């Protein structure tokens, strides 16, 4: 349905980046989406915040609460390889 609050993200490449999804979506979901667009295997791309790898089961809401509380949209994340 896509009816809960949606978070806006901006994915920057760490050596189509504006993404929106549910606060309930997890890192692993976003990574799988990214891999599909990048035509890669899931093991090959990492999702990070401030250059530190994010846990697969963490929700976007959890990232927002713990890293981005009260900060302006979009939530800034990195992806690598």
């Amino acid at each position: 349905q896509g009816t809960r609050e949606q978070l806006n993200l901006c994915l920057e490449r760490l050596s189509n980046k504006y993404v929106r999804c549910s606060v309930r979506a997890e890192v692993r979901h976003l990574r799988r989406v990214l891999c599909h667009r990048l035509m890669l295997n899931p093991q090959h791309v990492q999702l990070l915040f401030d250059n530190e790898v994010l846990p697969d089961h963490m929700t976007m809401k959890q990232i927002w609460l713990s890293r981005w509380f009260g900060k302006p949209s979009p939530l800034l994340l990195q992806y690598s390889v």
Partner: protein, 118 residues
Amino acid sequence: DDFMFELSDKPLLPCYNLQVSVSRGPCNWFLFSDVLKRLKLSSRIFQARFPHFEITTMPKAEFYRQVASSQLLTPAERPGGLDDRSPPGSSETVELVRYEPDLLRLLGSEVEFQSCNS
């Protein structure tokens, strides 16, 4: 469940989580004017060609009230606040269009679904 991701090379239109009547649960909406501006199409054209998209209206003051209750939106991002009442004897409103995948595509976004377990 089946999480939908909107993706684009450019910044996305902001969407608002609203309950537009007591008889239905909340969901997401764009301001209709934001959508028309982005598409550079008029309301008449839009509603004639894409009749399945849901257009609804809401009191501007009620729109502000519900938007102000969002935890994710900062005060600067909110279109209006609790101090922005409409003048007496008026009915200022906003037009909203429901957030849904076919509209995201029309707006130029890529849409991707992910349903692997959470």
